[PDB]
User: Fold ferripyoverdine receptor from Pseudomonas aeruginosa.
Amino acid sequence: QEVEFDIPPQALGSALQEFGRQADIQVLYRPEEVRNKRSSAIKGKLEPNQAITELLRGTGASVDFQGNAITISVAEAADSSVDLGATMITSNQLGTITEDSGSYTPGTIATATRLVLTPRETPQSITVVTRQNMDDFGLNNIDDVMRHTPGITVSAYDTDRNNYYARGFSINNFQYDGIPSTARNVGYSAGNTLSDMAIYDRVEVLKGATGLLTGAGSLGATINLIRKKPTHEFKGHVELGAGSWDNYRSELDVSGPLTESGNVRGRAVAAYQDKHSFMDHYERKTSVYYGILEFDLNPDTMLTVGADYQDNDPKGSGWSGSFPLFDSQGNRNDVSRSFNNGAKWSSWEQYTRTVFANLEHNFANGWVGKVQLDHKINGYHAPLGAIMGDWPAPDNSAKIVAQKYTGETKSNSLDIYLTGPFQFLGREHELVVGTSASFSHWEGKSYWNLRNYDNTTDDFINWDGDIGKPDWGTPSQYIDDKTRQLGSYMTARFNVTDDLNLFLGGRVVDYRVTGLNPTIRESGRFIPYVGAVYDLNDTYSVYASYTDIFMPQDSWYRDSSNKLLEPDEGQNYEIGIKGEYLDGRLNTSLAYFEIHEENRAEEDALYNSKPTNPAITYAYKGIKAKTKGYEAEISGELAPGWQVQAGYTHKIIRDDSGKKVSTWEPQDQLSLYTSYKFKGALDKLTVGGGARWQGKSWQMVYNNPRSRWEKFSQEDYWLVDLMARYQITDKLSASVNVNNVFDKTYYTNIGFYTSASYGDPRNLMFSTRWDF
Ligand SMILES: CCCCCCCCOCCOCCOCCOCCOCCO
Ligand SMILES: CCCCCCCCOCCOCCOCCOCCOCCO
Assistant:
């Protein structure tokens, strides 16, 4: 539908970038093709496809319409053979918006290098959950997304915190709009497991070792969440929802031009959710507001300012698990899926807010620059109280552990980068060069010295959460942890031949953890990034990459000598083939990857047996560890109204002990999510289903009362989702999702501090969405 245009004749480059903006569409073109060319005038309200053919008039250029992207090409009657991965500059530095693409495969992406590249161009495993996927499958928060993300396994620490493994590792790398947060521990990290999907276009997950743009982080993966953006045409929707266990949700999303010309624009969202659960006495209100204003200082300088805010506010939160495995005498406990060992008043509320600003500028060059400022708060308020220990006892009584943690973390980030093309041996290449600084400050209070509490209860079998609330007494501890991260990075992408793209970069890193622990310091650390992509046909490419990452150890991971262990460090080695079809409407990837860890913190038993250095009392050892496996995925259009996303991941990870590690992460996993839009009589109907399988997994947990280690197993299980949607009316639709159709009862945690969590039983969600 028609858009308001005004692009005066100028370099075809500026015109192409000015078009991308005014049209909310991403424009890709080759620098050396548009250089000495100029665009013809376009003026007025217009349909975008008329607009571009009108803009290119006189220029030799053609247009490949590609959903939210158009790519401009200029054909020659020469054409010696084709350069499919030729260097292409790009109007949207985050890549292609997925909203209204109607697809499950992503458009372009810059998760890997800061350079906008398509998944066939990206020489690392990159999986993306697209805006429409989130819509069709009910994926309302990051937990729901991860569960539906190929290669990811979500396991539970407690009601208010989950865990995401990839390739043998706990992911601790989150970004927002490509900006790393600090996530050293749960301190800095409040509400990361919980982000609402309402403010986002999509979450892109880079799996492997992602040091280059993450800086210091964990192995396995980065989860980069991309924010929703304002647009030039007015539009929004209102959505209202209702599912199993008094789970109710509203959501408002509004966006467009805020002045007659269009040079300031805004988008706003609020969503609210209040739900109980299968688990007894658990309930949880979340609120989310977001707001973004875009200003065009002038047509090649844009200033963006905005804020978001989320509060997660639960009741009956548990600390660890849903109930304890063994009782007082050592027998495995057997309890309803509703059992919830947290107190009625127990809360692990976790909150988040961001004030940010960006300036982005286009240089005559066709080079573009961007400055990003972030102020971020992660807060928690956790007066927790639950049953732990080896309970119940023969007489049915049990004991509460109740402690209270409050705190807040304030962050500031500046990031700057410059991106552009450049000629070298008579071919076109691109470079990114960036610098970044983050300072972040955790300040907390703890309470364990409880005045005059009687923490026993007289009925385990009927635990209602109905216990007293203690006198927290005075603070027990005061936290003060300041991290400082600086880094500078560089990648070049050489178009070496018409089939070979060579990727060369690094990041140099400075990292300081200051406060109540002895200082932790790592200076001038270098993180390599070497990769290549060789084209085989119009369809298939092979790629191989070598990527690195490290993370300075927690202060409490010292050795025999009482020396902080050296940074936890990894190299992902990856070789693979990617396939592309139907003009990028469908994508396939088959990969073999390997991970080499070093300094994986490990207890050190011989020593801990009997402390001899009185300096340390419980020392660790840094060992090596190795992850080997392969992965296949597919995403996009299988036929005309028929989308899938599917994956298959295999891994084993062992350490120098030889023994398997991360054994709760299954060794083999599988995801297939599909929907179909009929045509003709039924063309208002959309039908959807999905399955996720994973094989055997387990923990060794120690039955204390019996004085022996036991293995707990979760037998391989399927989970099936079903989905239908009918568009009754132009402006109004009604959906239903049913998850876990066969009501499979399984475990999402066995073994976390000797407890267990059950996965969601069958649940339905009903909703209507209304578009103005
Ligand atoms: C220092 C704090 C920075 C916070 C920035 C937050 C900005 C919040 O502003 C919300 C703007 O949203 C714009 C809503 O867009 C709706 C467009 O419709 C306009 C009215 O339509 C009239 C006839 O169509
Ligand atoms: C352990 C218990 C789980 C129960 C399992 C139930 C699964 C079967 O449910 C089938 C759902 O079909 C009901 C169809 O209702 C249609 C919904 O229409 C939406 C209304 O929108 C109103 C618009 O204003």
User: Anything to note?
Assistant: The radius of gyration is 27 Å. The chain is about 5% helix and 55% strand.
